[PDB]
From a paper:
MpPA14 ([name] [name] domain) lectin is a domain of a 1.5-MDa adhesin responsible for a symbiotic bacterium-diatom interaction in Antarctica. Bioinformatic analyses indicated the presence of an ∼20-kDa domain near the C terminus of MpIBP that is a member of the [name] family, which is a carbohydrate-binding lectin module widely distributed across several kingdoms of life. [name] domains share a β-sandwich fold and the presence of two consecutive aspartate residues in a cis peptide linkage (DcisD). The DcisD motif coordinates a Ca2+ ion that is directly involved in binding polar vicinal hydroxyl groups of various carbohydrates.
Similarly, 3-O-methyl-glucose cannot bind MpPA14 via the 3,4-diol because of the substituted methyl group on its C-3. This sugar compensates by binding using the 1,2-diol of the β-anomer, resulting in its considerably weaker binding to the lectin compared to that of glucopyranoses and mannose.
Residue numbers in the entry: 10 to 191
């Protein structure tokens, strides 16, 4: 039985190897069990300095979500998160606008909808639009990492052609696709 909460299932992975791109972080995820798990209920993390994977920087980055950490990871030089679950979206057109250091990839129903496949200091990208064909809980996953230095991750979403954007949070997230009443 998987817990039902208004958020995505979060895993944190640290490493002392360099993370240069999405493939490197995905390989880290594949290589071992998560260094910590958490509930990602308010996906607006950071900004901070001096390496996400050091000290209590992960706690600071995750903020409101850090109280669900399964453990306090030890130090690493590099690290990132893998989030997976569901997001309620009505049928229609949407686009992400993501602020991040370093890179990331967001997929919905198996299709990438926001990608930065490299390291970068803090930068905001307005991504291309995508469509949702059927209203309901859509499958979503995210990866984000920090190679070192500063770190931030805020993937906002627009339903109105880029006029307004919202953070993905407990209003619309579900860990299993069932309706949360939490
Ligand atoms: C600490 O500053 C940032 C770092 O966070 C980013 O990963 O890579 C950038 C270039 O090294 C740095 O300027
Ligand atoms: Ca794993
Ligand atoms: Ca720590
Ligand atoms: Ca915060
Ligand atoms: Ca590094
Ligand atoms: Ca960084």
């Amino acid at each position: 039985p998987d817990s039902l909460f208004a958020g995505l299932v979060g895993e944190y992975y640290g490493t002392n190897s360099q993370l240069n791109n999405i493939s490197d972080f995905r390989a880290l995820v594949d290589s071992k069990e998560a260094d910590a798990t958490f509930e990602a209920a308010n996906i607006s993390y950071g900004r901070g300095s001096s390496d996400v994977a050091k000290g209590t920087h992960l706690q600071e980055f995750l903020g409101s979500d850090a109280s669900t950490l399964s453990t306090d990871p030890g130090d690493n030089t590099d690290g990132g998160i893998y989030l997976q679950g569901y997001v309620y979206l009505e049928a229609g057109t949407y686009n992400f606008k993501v602020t991040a250091d370093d890179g990331y990839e967001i997929t919905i129903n198996g299709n990438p909808v926001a990608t930065v496949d490299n390291n970068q200091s803090v930068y905001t990208v307005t991504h291309a639009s995508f469509t949702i064909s059927e209203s309901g809980y859509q499958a979503i996953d995210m990866i984000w990492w920090d190679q070192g230095g500063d770190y931030v991750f805020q993937p906002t979403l627009s339903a109105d052609g880029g006029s307004t954007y919202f953070v993905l949070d407990s209003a619309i997230l579900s860990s299993t696709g069932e309706t949360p009443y939490t």
